[PDB]
mmCIF file of C-alpha atoms in Angstrom:
data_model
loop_
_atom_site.group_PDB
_atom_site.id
_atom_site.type_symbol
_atom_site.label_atom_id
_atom_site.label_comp_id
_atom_site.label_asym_id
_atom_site.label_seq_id
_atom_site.Cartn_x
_atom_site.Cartn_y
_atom_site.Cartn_z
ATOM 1 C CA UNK A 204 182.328 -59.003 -37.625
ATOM 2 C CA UNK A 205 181.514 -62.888 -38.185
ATOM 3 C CA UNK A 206 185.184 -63.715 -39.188
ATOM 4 C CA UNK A 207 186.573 -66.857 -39.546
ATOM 5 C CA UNK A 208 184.408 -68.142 -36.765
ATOM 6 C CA UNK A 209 180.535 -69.348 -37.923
ATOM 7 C CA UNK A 210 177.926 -69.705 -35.420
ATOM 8 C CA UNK A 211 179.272 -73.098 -33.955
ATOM 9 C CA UNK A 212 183.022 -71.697 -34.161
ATOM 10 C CA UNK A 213 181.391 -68.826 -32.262
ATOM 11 C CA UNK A 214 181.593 -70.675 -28.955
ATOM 12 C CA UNK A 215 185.129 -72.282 -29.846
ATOM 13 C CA UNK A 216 186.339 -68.970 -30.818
ATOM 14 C CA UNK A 217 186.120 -67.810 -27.321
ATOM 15 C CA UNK A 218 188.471 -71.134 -26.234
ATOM 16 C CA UNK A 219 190.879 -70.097 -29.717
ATOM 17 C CA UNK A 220 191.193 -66.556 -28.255
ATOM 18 C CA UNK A 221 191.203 -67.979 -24.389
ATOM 19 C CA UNK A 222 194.690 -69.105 -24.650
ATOM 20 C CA UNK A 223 195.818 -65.868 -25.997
ATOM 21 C CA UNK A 224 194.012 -64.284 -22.973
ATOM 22 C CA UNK A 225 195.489 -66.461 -20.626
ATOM 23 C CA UNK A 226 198.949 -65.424 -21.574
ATOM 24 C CA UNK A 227 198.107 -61.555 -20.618
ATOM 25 C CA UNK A 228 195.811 -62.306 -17.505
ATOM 26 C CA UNK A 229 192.671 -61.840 -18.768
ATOM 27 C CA UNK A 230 190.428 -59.866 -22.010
ATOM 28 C CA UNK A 231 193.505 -57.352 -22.263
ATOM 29 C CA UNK A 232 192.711 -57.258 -26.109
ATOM 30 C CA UNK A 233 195.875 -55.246 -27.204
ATOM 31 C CA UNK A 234 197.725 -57.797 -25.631
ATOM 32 C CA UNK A 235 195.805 -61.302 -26.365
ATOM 33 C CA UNK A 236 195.289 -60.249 -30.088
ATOM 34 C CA UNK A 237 199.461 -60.360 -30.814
ATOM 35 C CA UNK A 238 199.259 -63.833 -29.589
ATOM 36 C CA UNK A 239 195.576 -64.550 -30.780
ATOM 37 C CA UNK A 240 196.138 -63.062 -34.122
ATOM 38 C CA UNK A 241 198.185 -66.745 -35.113
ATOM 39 C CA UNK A 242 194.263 -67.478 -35.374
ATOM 40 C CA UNK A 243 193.820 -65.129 -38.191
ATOM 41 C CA UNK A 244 189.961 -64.398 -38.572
ATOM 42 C CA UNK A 245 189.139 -65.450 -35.027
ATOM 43 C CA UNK A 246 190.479 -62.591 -33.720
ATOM 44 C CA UNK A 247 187.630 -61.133 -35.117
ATOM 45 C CA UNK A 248 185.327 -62.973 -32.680
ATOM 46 C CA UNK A 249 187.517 -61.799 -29.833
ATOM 47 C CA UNK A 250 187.121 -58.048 -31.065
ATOM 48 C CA UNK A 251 183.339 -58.607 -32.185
ATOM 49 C CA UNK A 252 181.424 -57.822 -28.671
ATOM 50 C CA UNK A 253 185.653 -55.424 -27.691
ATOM 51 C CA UNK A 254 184.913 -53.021 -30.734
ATOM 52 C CA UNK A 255 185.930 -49.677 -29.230
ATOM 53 C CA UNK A 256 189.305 -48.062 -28.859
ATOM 54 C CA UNK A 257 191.438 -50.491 -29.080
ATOM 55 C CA UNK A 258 190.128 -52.699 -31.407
ATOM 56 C CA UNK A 259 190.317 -49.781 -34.239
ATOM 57 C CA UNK A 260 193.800 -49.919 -32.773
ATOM 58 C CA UNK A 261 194.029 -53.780 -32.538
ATOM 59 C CA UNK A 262 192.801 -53.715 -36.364
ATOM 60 C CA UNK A 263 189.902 -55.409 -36.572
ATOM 61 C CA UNK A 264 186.901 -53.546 -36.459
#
């Protein structure tokens, strides 16, 4: 899903959802999207390319 992060955002969302990242240890998406999900809608960039298992369980996609 686009979300709340347009083609320009696209390439910031990956910096929004970075810090969220960065306070697991990495693309640990059940744990960067409790932090990352302060950014409501550019979570959805985070899950865009991570929709699989968790990611239905993350509540995105």
């Amino acid at each position: 899903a686009m979300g709340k992060c347009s083609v320009l955002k696209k390439v910031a969302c990956a910096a929004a959802i970075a810090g969220a990242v960065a306070a697991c240890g990495g693309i640990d998406l059940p744990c960067v999207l409790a932090a990352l999900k302060a950014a409501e809608g550019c979570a959805s960039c985070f899950c865009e390319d991570h929709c699989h298992g968790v990611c239905k369980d993350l509540h995105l996609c």
